[PDB]
Homo-oligomer: A and B are copies of this chain.
Amino acid sequence: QEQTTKSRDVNSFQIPLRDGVRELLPEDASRNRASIKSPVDIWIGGENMTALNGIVDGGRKFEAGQEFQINTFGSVNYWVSDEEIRVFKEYSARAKYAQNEGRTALEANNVPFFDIDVPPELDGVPFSLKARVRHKSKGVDGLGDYTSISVKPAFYITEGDETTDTLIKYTSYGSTGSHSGYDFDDNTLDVMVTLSAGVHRVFPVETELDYDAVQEVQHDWYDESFTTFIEVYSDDPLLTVKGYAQILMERT
């Protein structure tokens, strides 16, 4: 129907890969070729591709890091994930008390962590990091029901990569009272963080060791606190993206 023509122009750019079946390339009569690399496994297909319940039909996989080409001028669809936001961790275990003793010390004392891989596309770009946080003190470890516990949850994050030792403490709120830990009373820790490209390690911790906890139930650093990081997540569009596909496009 349409004769092949030479491509004069190259255009290179990044596509944000998001959730569900979405268009990777639009119908574009000018386009002759696209060379594409996805940082995650990616399913590629035509208008028939669907992904009901995370099962792709009418697609085929290309691997993370695999360079491939599409030479059509028509619409092309992708699927990578059904995750609407980015959930880093969900914890049921109470978080530990921790002073800023550095990465090695926290790992040595079994403080759970997770890593954020900051893509070049997010290098030095501020983003929202949140947690759903549950404080419960009433009767916990036998603590009095009316004992006032001060809490201040934090993320301790490496300023360099996961091989460096120094941590930056990030906080957004403090709270004091007798915590009943009812699910509807959960707090939101919400900080902006700005990170260099690469992997950064994050330790969700309780920073406040309350005098009353020390006296009544012999709590000490690295012990389980009255604070639990129910969910650590981001709904920031910069983080909910599953990765950026690299595109070199050629057009007439």
Q: Does A59 contact B (CB under 8 A)?
A: yes
Whether A49 contacts B12 by the Cβ 8 Å rule is yes
Please tell me the number of chain A residues within 8 Å of chain B, measured between CB atoms. Answer: 44
Whether B73 contacts A7 by the Cβ 8 Å rule is yes
User: A1 is contacted by which of B8, B11, B246 (Cβ under 8 Å)?
Assistant: B8
Tell me whether A46 and B246 are in contact in the complex, defined as CB-CB below 8 angstroms, given that A3-B6, A35-B68, A67-B66 are known contacts. Answer: no
CA distance A8 to B25 in the complex (A): 12
Whether A6 contacts B32 by the Cβ 8 Å rule is yes
Q: Does A184 contact B (CB under 8 A)?
A: no
B residues less than 8 Å from A74 (CB atoms): 7-10
Q: In A8-22, which residues have CB < 8 Å from any B CB?
A: 8-14
User: A248 is contacted by which of B3, B10, B44, B66 (Cβ under 8 Å)?
Assistant: B44
User: A246 is contacted by which of B4, B7, B60, B67 (Cβ under 8 Å)?
Assistant: B60
Q: Does A218 contact B (CB under 8 A)?
A: no
Report how many copies the assembly holds: 4
Closest to A4 in B: B4
Fill in one digit per residue for A40-53: 1 if any B CB lies within 8 Å of its CB, else 0: 00011110110000
B residues less than 8 Å from A33 (CB atoms): 71
Tell me whether A2 and B11 are in contact in the complex, defined as CB-CB below 8 angstroms, given that A35-B68, A69-B35 are known contacts. Answer: no
Q: Does A116 contact B (CB under 8 A)?
A: no
B residues less than 8 Å from A66 (CB atoms): 67
B residues less than 8 Å from A13 (CB atoms): 58, 60
Which of A6, A49, A76, A246 is packed against the most chain B CB atoms within 10 Å? A6
Interface class of chain A by DSSP:
strand
Distance of A77 from chain B, by nearest CB (Å): 8
Whether B12 contacts A59 by the Cβ 8 Å rule is yes
Whether A73 contacts B6 by the Cβ 8 Å rule is yes
Give A residues with C-beta under 8 Å from B.
1-14, 27, 32-33, 35, 43-46, 48-49, 58-62, 66-74, 76, 246-248, 250, 252
Give 26 pairs: A residue, B residue, CB < 8 Å, sorted on A.
Answer: A1-B8, A2-B8, A2-B252, A3-B5, A3-B6, A4-B6, A6-B32, A7-B74, A8-B73, A9-B46, A10-B44, A10-B45, A10-B72, A11-B45, A11-B46, A12-B43, A12-B45, A12-B46, A12-B58, A12-B59, A13-B60, A35-B68, A35-B69, A60-B246, A60-B247, A66-B67
